[PDB]
Design a protein around this ligand. Sequence first.
Ligand code: HEM
Ligand code: HEM
Lengths: 137, 137
Amino acid sequence: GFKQDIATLRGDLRTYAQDIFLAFLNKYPDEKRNFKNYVGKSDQELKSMAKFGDHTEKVFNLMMEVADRATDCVPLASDASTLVQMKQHSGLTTGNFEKLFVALVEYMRASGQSFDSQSWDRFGKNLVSALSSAGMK
Amino acid sequence: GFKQDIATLRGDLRTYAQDIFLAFLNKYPDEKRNFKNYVGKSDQELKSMAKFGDHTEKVFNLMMEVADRATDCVPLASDASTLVQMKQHSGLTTGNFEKLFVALVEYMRASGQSFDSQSWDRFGKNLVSALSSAGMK
Ligand code: HEM
Ligand code: HEM
């Protein structure tokens, strides 16, 4: 279930973070404009940039911290408030996060792994709600 | 589901609140140490004691608001803080709440009605977790 999938993801977090994030940027190419250094590059070009793997891992590490601290796939309001207040999240609206989770869910479903994709879909919905309640537009 | 059950209970709340609270006090008779005016009384005696009806209705009035404000059966932290800090809940520990929800779920399962008993089980558990988070021992 959800707890085990956090351990699956953590065990090879570099690899999953890159593959899920690429699945997001490819499913929603307009989302690339939040990442100007990534524009005009294919997947394998991106994986050659040191900050791409380092950034993407750090994003999914904080995702996994928020997921492990959630109760019944409802994240803490304090964690949602950390993500709203991050400087690097200044432009963003909740739909950015909505689409990342749609991509993540789609990825888990297409993988051969026994991920609890229903729980990650609830988690994504409940994180979007919590980001709104913590003051994201 | 859970949202419908909140409307079911609200539709006949003083009856459900007294039957549920009686089921709790009768399943865990030691719990009357918190309600000493209830000692030595049959169900029908308690149902003719004004503060039994009035206070038990007010307990359920607030319980249904906490449930209605929850997301996926996880209550708001502000509601859990309210319940920890209430003067009338001084010295209570989370075990008191755990047993209340055990009794409430068993009452739902035994009823002729159609409740989502599993959602109430989760809600009890998640409420106890939130009470502990908000500093109840
Ligand atoms: C739960 C989901 C998310 C988490 C846990 C998260 C976490 C993080 C973290 C930890 C960083 C710092 C990375 C570093 O400096 O190495 C970061 C940077 C950033 N994040 Fe997020 N983020 C999430 C969702 C998103 C989404 C959906 C977008 C836009 C579609 C976004 C846009 C950015 C941008 C533009 C930066 C700075 C640029 C960069 O690091 O390349 N984030 N995020
Ligand atoms: C989610 C569950 C609970 C909610 C929403 C809640 C709510 C309330 C409210 C609104 C009152 C005020 C009643 C009034 O003064 O008219 C009350 C009083 C009180 N509650 Fe709770 N309560 C809950 C669980 C419990 C539990 C589990 C116990 C102990 C087993 C308990 C013990 C008390 C006591 C001792 C009083 C004051 C004495 C009395 O009303 O007779 N409560 N509670």
